[PDB]
Design a protein around this ligand. Sequence first.
Ligand SMILES: Nc1ncnc2c1ncn2[C@@H]1O[C@H](CSCC[C@H](N)C(=O)O)[C@@H](O)[C@H]1O
Ligand SMILES: Nc1ncnc2c1ncn2[C@@H]1O[C@H](CSCC[C@H](N)C(=O)O)[C@@H](O)[C@H]1O
Ligand SMILES: Nc1ncnc2c1ncn2[C@@H]1O[C@H](CSCC[C@H](N)C(=O)O)[C@@H](O)[C@H]1O
Lengths: 53, 1058, 53, 53, 106
Amino acid sequence: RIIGMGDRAVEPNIRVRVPFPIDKNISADFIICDINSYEDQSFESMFSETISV
Amino acid sequence: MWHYTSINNDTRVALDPKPNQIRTITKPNTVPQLGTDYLYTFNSQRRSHTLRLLGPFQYFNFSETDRGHPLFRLPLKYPSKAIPADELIDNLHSWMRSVHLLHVRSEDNTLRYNWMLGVYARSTNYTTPVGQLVVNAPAILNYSNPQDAFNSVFVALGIDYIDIPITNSNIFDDSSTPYNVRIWHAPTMTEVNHILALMRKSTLVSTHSSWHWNVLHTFHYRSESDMIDHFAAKILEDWRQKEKLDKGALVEADRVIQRLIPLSSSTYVQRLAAIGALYPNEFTENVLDLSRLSTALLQLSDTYYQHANDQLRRLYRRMYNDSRTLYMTQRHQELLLAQITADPNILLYPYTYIFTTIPTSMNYISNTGQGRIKHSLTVTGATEHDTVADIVLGQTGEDVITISMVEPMSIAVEDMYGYVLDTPTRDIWPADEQIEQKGDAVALYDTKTSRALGMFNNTVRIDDLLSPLLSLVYRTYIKGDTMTMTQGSLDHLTLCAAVDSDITFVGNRMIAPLPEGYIPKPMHRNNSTMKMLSLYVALKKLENFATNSYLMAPDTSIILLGAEREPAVNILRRFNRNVSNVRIIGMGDRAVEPNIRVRVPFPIDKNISADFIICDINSYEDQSFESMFSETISVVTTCASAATRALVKINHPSEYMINSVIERLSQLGGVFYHTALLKTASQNPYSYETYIYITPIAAAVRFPFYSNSAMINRYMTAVADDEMPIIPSIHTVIKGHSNTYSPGLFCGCVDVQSAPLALSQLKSYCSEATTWRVDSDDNLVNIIARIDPARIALEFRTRSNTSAYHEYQRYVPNGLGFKVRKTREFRYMHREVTFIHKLMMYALIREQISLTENMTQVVSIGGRNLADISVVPLNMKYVVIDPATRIETLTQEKKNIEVQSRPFQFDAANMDLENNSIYLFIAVIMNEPNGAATPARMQMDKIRNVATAMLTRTNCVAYISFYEAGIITRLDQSTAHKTIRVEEGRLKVANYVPVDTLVEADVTLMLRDIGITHEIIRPSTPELIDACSNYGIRLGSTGGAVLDVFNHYSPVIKLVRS
Amino acid sequence: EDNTLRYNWMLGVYARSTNYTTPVGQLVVNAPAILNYSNPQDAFNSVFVALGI
Amino acid sequence: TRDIWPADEQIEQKGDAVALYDTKTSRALGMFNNTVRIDDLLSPLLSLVYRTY
Amino acid sequence: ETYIYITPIAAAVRFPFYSNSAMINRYMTAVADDEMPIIPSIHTVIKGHSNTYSPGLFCGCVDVQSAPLALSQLKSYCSEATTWRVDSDDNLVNIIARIDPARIAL
Ligand SMILES: Nc1ncnc2c1ncn2[C@@H]1O[C@H](CSCC[C@H](N)C(=O)O)[C@@H](O)[C@H]1O
Ligand SMILES: Nc1ncnc2c1ncn2[C@@H]1O[C@H](CSCC[C@H](N)C(=O)O)[C@@H](O)[C@H]1O
Ligand SMILES: Nc1ncnc2c1ncn2[C@@H]1O[C@H](CSCC[C@H](N)C(=O)O)[C@@H](O)[C@H]1O
């Protein structure tokens, strides 16, 4: 099973947010995260986004 | 201050061959043989013949004399490929052979040959004064410096300008040109100012900022309607050149600005020029760019006129009225300042204007590539809704959206054949309970099983599930195959259903040969053959666990008692064809040769005899119990003595029937018999059709009888007529935050303008959704949504609607997905057995909670905000106690939800439960907080310590679920093990880590001296029906055999004590 | 532009196939927008009132 | 390599991140960043073993 | 663009944090705006023993009669060079040379 998710996705990729509100029960053996973008925001707000990922 | 950089260098000027090499690159190209230089692709559009010559034969116009004669005509008028690849190479060679230009070989190494003007004269046969000049003196076309190339052909003639038609790249598109160009005589800077002021008030002309050759030249268009096709073509390029510059890179496109500048023009390109000269915020693109573009940009220009917003409109209107000057943006202007000082004496567009206000973007995000986007909606957001519209949709069509149901599924190959064996447990049949069980069978029989149960029984069948796929490996069989290997599970499969005829094996592995011209018919399978082929296998599995047999030793006899006339015999005969001498006999009370028509058992004589008997007797409605019983019981006792290892079939597994079957065997036969019933796959789920396998003991049987009856119990749960069939349906209508909708799903289409209006409301009923646009410029968006009671119970808690309008509105227009062709949607979805088991877990507790006098709070321990359904009423507070979960937003919106971020414990050290708290203990009393595995002696304390406290706490029910031991061996002898695998010592359900079993005999006994009240309630059929009906979920067929066993051995113990 | 319209297939192809010769097939030449309807039944009510048949 | 994060250097490292972020990395560094990419390096060859296939 | 791989220890980690930060340091060397983008270019011109040329490369063609005249001067700016005639009887020789600061300083 190879699943794909993101905040701009298209079937069979599923369009969601990160982390996303409660429920939905994400689960896997491996996760590869490539989150980032797309310009821009001040440091005090950017930090809270990077650290939350 | 970024001031990006670039390299500006003429790209046309540096194409012209040398004056002494111009000889080489023209005629002497007969030595080489083309091949890769020119570009050719062919489409069966049809038709397309894009044959395009590249440098140095690009921008080359063709004379009408040597155009048609040599080549072009005939190759085109095949027309339909055809068109051998040899034709192009050999024929194009023939053309390029006979061609040359007039020139003079020079000695100076710093000369260049004018290509453009040279080929212009040649192609016109030197007819005009411009082309005749280069006949008497062909050395005029040699120059050492650009610009000075043309200065020599205005002074020598006395003319002011030269007009020249353009070149079409495609050499098979023989049509009139869209426009032409005109080159003006202009030496100095002061001349350009004089000419461009003269270009005004004249038909239709244009320019473009800078120029190649350092000499003024302009464009002249044919008609007004064919100008916007050229403006919209250049504007598109400038948007790409500044895309790489604004980020910062290296480009080589000289000129700096590609945008065209309309001089004397109409009124359609003044509107178009304005919108293009402000670099709109098409990011991501949107716009509807692919097509038609020429009309999409006209709609775009209408946007900024009123939009969006302010000084953006003003900028637009400051360009609409003007459109006479070149508008630049500081940074982009600097490129000209950087290169105007690098080399003096170079012409630029006199009239420039600089502005620094973009200012900003929205911005947007979207995509325009094939795809069908799924959505996942939530119950919180940053917006506030109150009293909104009812966004109505209707009409699906049958072309775009097809609605069906069974559902069809997709599995493997060996998984088609598996079974689960049960085992008796009782050793005595009381004479006081022998008439108690009878009364249950008699009273039940009178009224047939629930009408609601039969809503799925004869509605869907195994045939409709497996056949669809089973007849696709038929197409695979044809022409194609690999190593097959006799005996294997693949072997008898492709021998059976795929091929009516026999199968020849050569090497025990190969499939050969091929069907030359005759196509062998697909074996016609039947409803009464699928049950027999999966039982034949089970029969061989019950004999010996050793795998890879399936074939018998020579001189073995098997007889079937059908179920005639039915095939099966032919299938189990062709399979045993190769193996020496095997006898497969078929009999029944409706049979046809080679099947023998008889009765059962049949009067004396005839001497029936075999090694194995498979009985499928029954039917066909109807007769009263006292007469039916005597028929069912007479079948068993006449197959038990007919063979040594037979298997029989009974209806109504009611615990009376099964016990009367054993009773009638233990008395007659010597040394008793050993009996055990079983289920197999492909038996039509929830059909209460069990099978009884009979073995001649091996000594003396310990526990012949049944006690609680686990597998049978399924049957003994049906009830008489009640309420209604339920039945899912469609709505095609949406209210805003309004309760009361029937289970099912709904779909339609809405205006893209109010697409995100619908999405903001769908969150109240469902979590999943699917959208797509049919075509890029239809503006209609199709929507499918599915109603789940798992979200309804979470939506309508209080009054807060919120939602997130802002989030979804960022899709319009494009970004909702694009999908062509047709698509089919189904009704009953597909879920495994890990999910359905839980749907029965919560369907049970819901009945128990919503019945008691009074409640204070419902408490769950472990989960993802799950088991929300079951909390009744919705007014009731809901508490979650788990170490890991998401908090805040969901708990802030007055949902009466609260979460404690602490690990619970079961030591009776700090217990505080109190009046009316309902605690759930799902799976959190098993393994560790991380995901390891715990002993079986450390899980008992999690009940002892909860009870110890509960003894003093006022009537406070605790709901606890735990695994029942005995599975150890019950799923070890079985053949179905795709899931619910047992790792010798531990149960492996789903994922996690395999967990230890709990000895039910000890767990029950140990609570008879500490605890007070402890009732064990197991989920039954009624919970299965309600689960499948509300959610709309089919049973997993091969997982259905898993459910009706796994379900039983997970007790839910209710500790309701005061 | 309205997303809640449906095109009458049966009547449309009937007229086309007869070269719009009959009064019923000529009606849909001057005004081909008559074949659009939002509600069944009302599809046909428009081609009896306009003809008088 | 480190085992302790000093509480006196936790705000010294912060000041470096905050002061640096404000101004994007060197313009000269970006002369090669978005100018050349892996795609332009490997794809040329990667699509020649396509013809081999 | 670095990546962070995370593993659930196996017992207790010794050195979880970073000190000098070697791989990260690369990032922490960028500065604000300064001078110029530099950018290589072409010259198509040769002076005899005269300093001050912009980095990059230059090329063209000369009369074969004065081919070795150019070669005697290219040695001042570069070490590598490439020449070829187009055709046997053109008498034009194409020259490509590349400027190296490893030779300028010598
Ligand atoms: N939690 C989140 N919030 C916002 N955007 C997210 C996200 N998780 C992933 N993304 C997406 O990740 C992207 C970072 S750049 C990703 C590369 C880009 N998708 C490409 O195809 O080249 C953003 O476009 C963003 O939409
Ligand atoms: N002793 C017996 N008396 C009556 N019918 C018997 C019988 N033994 C077998 N049968 C037959 O078994 C059938 C039960 S249903 C069998 C399935 C059916 N033949 C089919 O092809 O789908 C009855 O039709 C009955 O004719
Ligand atoms: N002290 C405690 N008491 C009860 N549950 C606990 C606990 N500590 C942790 N848990 C929870 O028990 C769960 C074990 S795993 C349960 C299945 C998992 N929630 C799923 O959705 O698939 C974990 O989710 C964990 O959050």
